[PDB]
């Protein structure tokens, strides 16, 4: 008699992630925060934007 | 087959050493046929050969 | 004619001082593209199209 | 709950009837034992 395990998942919310460029997308996360304002990200890192001179 | 893997006849008959590629590709079996002229393994589609073994 | 496919990360097209006799340029969608280009010229380049 | 009361009564009666039958037969088994 193989047991049927039941999934143990925590509460999840729908969060808006506003990157440093102002663009906003929706995500599914567990944190309670509503809007995550990201000041630093791939859009403001030189390694991901080598041609950008403002960050250089 | 007994506890120590000893093979015993279950019926009166004649011992027959054979191989059954339909049952297991790489096993060798020992059987007992009621008619000495029979040959094992019996075709899977042939009716079972059995003896009454009772007295009225 | 063999048409390659290119991706533009940034910038805008400039026809100034162009070697080839080019006059105007415009960025069109897949729907507006068929209206501007010829039928035969469009029928050959429509297989490269994508969903959006 | 006008017509449902009528149906619930049929439900209660059936349950009450069996509850009476179960007690009317459990008493019989306690006599044979």
């Amino acid at each position: 008699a193989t047991f049927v395990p039941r999934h143990r998942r925590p509460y999840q919310f729908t969060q808006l992630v506003q990157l440093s460029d102002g663009s906003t997308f929706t995500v599914r996360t567990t944190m309670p925060t509503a809007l995550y304002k990201s000041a630093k990200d791939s859009r403001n890192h030189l390694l991901w934007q080598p041609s950008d001179k403002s960050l250089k | 087959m007994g506890r120590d893997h000893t093979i015993h006849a279950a019926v009166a008959g004649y011992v027959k050493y054979y191989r059954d590629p339909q049952l297991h590709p790489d096993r060798q079996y020992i059987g007992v046929v009621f008619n000495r002229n029979d040959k094992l393994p019996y075709p899977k589609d042939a009716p079972r050969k059995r003896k009454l073994g009772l007295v009225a | 004619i063999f048409f390659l496919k290119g991706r533009i990360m940034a910038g805008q097209a400039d026809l100034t001082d162009n070697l080839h006799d080019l006059v105007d340029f415009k960025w069109l969608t897949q729907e507006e593209l068929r209206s501007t280009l010829a039928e035969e010229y469009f029928h050959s380049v429509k297989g490269m199209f994508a969903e959006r | 709950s006008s017509v449902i009361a009528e149906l619930i009564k049929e439900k209660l009666a059936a349950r009450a009837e069996y509850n009476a039958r179960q007690s009317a037969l459990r008493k019989l088994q306690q006599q044979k034992m």
Partner: protein, 123 residues
């Protein structure tokens, strides 16, 4: 210790006995969920068949051009199929700098940024 108890209280809630029980739907609700389930799976089929159809058409276009390109000759005094043999080379395709990081890193976003496109980019 007090902080650890806060952690344990989180796991104690996820215990199999504490989590909610399996759903219990009636017939009408169950049938309604069946339609929602049935439609969603069919909707994926349409997206799948549509996504796979475009992928097939693009491959056919490449094969047509490539097969045709293989038969052509030139330019000038070049043996037939030279261009076909050169196009099939994969120099640097699997290297570190194969695909530019900038192009790949940029992704789709629900809403645009402050500056949707930068036309001032200079070589």
């Amino acid at each position: 210790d007090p902080r650890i108890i806060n952690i344990l209280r989180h796991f104690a809630v996820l215990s199999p006995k504490r989590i909610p029980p399996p759903l219990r739907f009636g017939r009408n609700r169950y049938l309604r969920h069946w339609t929602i389930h049935r439609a969603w799976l069919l909707f994926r089929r349409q997206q799948r068949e549509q996504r796979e159809r475009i992928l097939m058409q693009q491959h056919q276009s490449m094969s047509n051009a490539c097969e045709e390109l293989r038969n052509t000759e030139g330019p000038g005094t070049r043996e037939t199929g030279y261009l076909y043999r050169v196009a099939m080379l994969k120099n640097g395709v699997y290297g570190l700098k194969s695909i530019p990081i900038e192009y790949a890193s940029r992704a789709l976003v629900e809403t645009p940024g402050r500056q949707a496109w930068n036309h001032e980019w200079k070589r």
